[PDB]
């Protein structure tokens, strides 16, 4: 008959964190295939004892005392689980050696032998041994020895952002110099040193487009996109009117009807090199301003970061261009026969103008003017043309006129 007790397989050590749920499994088999009892108990007590302390160590075994419940293929599974109290000690003696016994249906029970038979040690550790926080992105501040509440909130946010797997019940404290204390729910802590959380902001924002000339064609609306970034990733102000000369130029452009829009100025993380802050300048230089050496506005812009560092005044320009600088007429698809190449008739001029018109729809402005000259060359006058800033193209008479005079006999 069966004289062999069941075989019990279980972890020798189970680390359980203070405050948290723990669970592990004990596996029991027997050659009979049936196990009738699995017991977790204190060493103390008579052979029949099932007294077990602490009260929060719990166990359960589904399928007890069922034929076929304890085979090698399908071992009997006993769950050992509980919640460690939040105020349990985590000292070296905060451990429990408890004994697991099993009995088959023939009554064979595993022997209970102090420090030798089947047992586990449940070891209670602080939550900080489970969690290792990651360093945040550096927060750049005006004074790393005296953080503002805004600085501290930013460090906490950057620590929480880099630590999505820490307990949600974890609290964060930032000291005057940026040292971060993370307090887990059991009162254990981690520290992130100030060197890994904050540094002094010593670099003013950068105007990426310093020195750039933005071309605006007279009489056509244009835009200029200006880009800024800071080492902190944040700009708080862009200032085109930092002194009298700058202000004058700025207000002159406003006077022409331009707009300046920097929509992300109040957003966080609005100004990195990869994703810079963008100021868009939109407007039209009217034709009443001529192009030429003086046909320009030289601006000065400054940008300030959240620590109060303001860049030097940095130059960019708007430079005016005539429309002829961006348009090139297409020649007519055929020449027009002329009886007298030195003096076209009205009908010949009309025919040329029509061919030049047809060749240029979709290319030149719809409000260009064509003047067919007496020799059949065509003056193209763009709508920004003025006496002070002529804006024109010429199509030569070899591209428009074909002499029809016969050849001698
Ligand atoms: C009460 C007594 O003297 N009993 C002895 C008995 O001693 C127990 O033997 C166990 C091993 O079989 C352990 O060595 C027990 O020590 C520990 C443990 O379980 O590891 C030490 C831990 O530090 C302690 N944990 C805490 C938080 O204090 C636990 C705990 O007090 C108990 O597990 C109760 O939950 O105990 C040791 O106490 C053994 O020596 C037998 C031999 O026959 O004689 C008496 O029964
Ligand atoms: C208008 C004025 O006299 N402002 C002076 C200021 O002198 C200005 O300083 C600017 C640099 O910050 C430019 O050098 C200004 O010159 C230009 C320019 O912007 O490039 C010359 C251009 O030809 C002119 N454009 C047109 C279409 O006439 C512009 C334009 O007049 C201005 O930008 C409008 O404000 O100006 C230069 O004039 C400087 O001298 C300060 C010192 O306190 O005093 C006034 O603000
Ligand atoms: Ca057996
Ligand atoms: Ca830790
Ligand atoms: Ca900065
Ligand atoms: Ca042209």
Residue numbers in the entry: 252 to 660
Sentences reproduced from the published study:
The serine-rich repeat (SRR) adhesins are a family of bacterial cell-surface glycoproteins containing two sequence motifs where serine constitutes ∼50% of the sequence. First, it contains two copies of the Siglec and Unique domains in tandem (SK1Siglec1-SK1Unique1-SK1Siglec2-SK1Unique2) with sequence identity/similarity of 39%/56% between the two Siglec domains and 44%/50% between the two Unique domains.
We therefore determined cocrystal structures of SK1BR soaked with either 10 mm sialyl T-antigen (sTa), a core 1 glycan that can be conjugated to Ser or Thr residues of glycoproteins, or 10 mm 3´-sialyl-N-acetyllactosamine (3´sLn), a trisaccharide that can be a component of larger, branched glycans. For both sTa and 3´sLn, we observed the appearance of unambiguous electron density adjacent to the noncanonical YTRY motif of both SK1Siglec1 and SK1Siglec2. Thus, SK1Siglec1 and SK1Siglec2 are both capable of binding sialoglycan ligands and can do so simultaneously. SK1Siglec1 hydrogen-bonds to the sialic acid and galactose of both sTa and 3´sLn via the YTKY sequence. Here, the low temperature factors of sTa and SK1Siglec1 suggest that the ligand has little mobility when bound, which may be interpreted as strong binding. Consistent with the crystallographic temperature factor analysis, SK1Siglec1+Unique1 showed a statistically significant preference for sTa. Upon ligand binding, the temperature factors of all loops become more similar to the temperature factors of the Siglec domain core in both SK1Siglec1 and SK1Siglec2 (compare A and B with C–F). Moreover, the temperature factors of the YTKY motif in SK1Siglec1 decreased upon ligand binding (compare A, and E). The temperature factors of the YTFK motif in SK1Siglec2 decrease upon sTa binding but do not decrease upon 3´sLn binding (compare Fig. 8, compare B, D, and F).
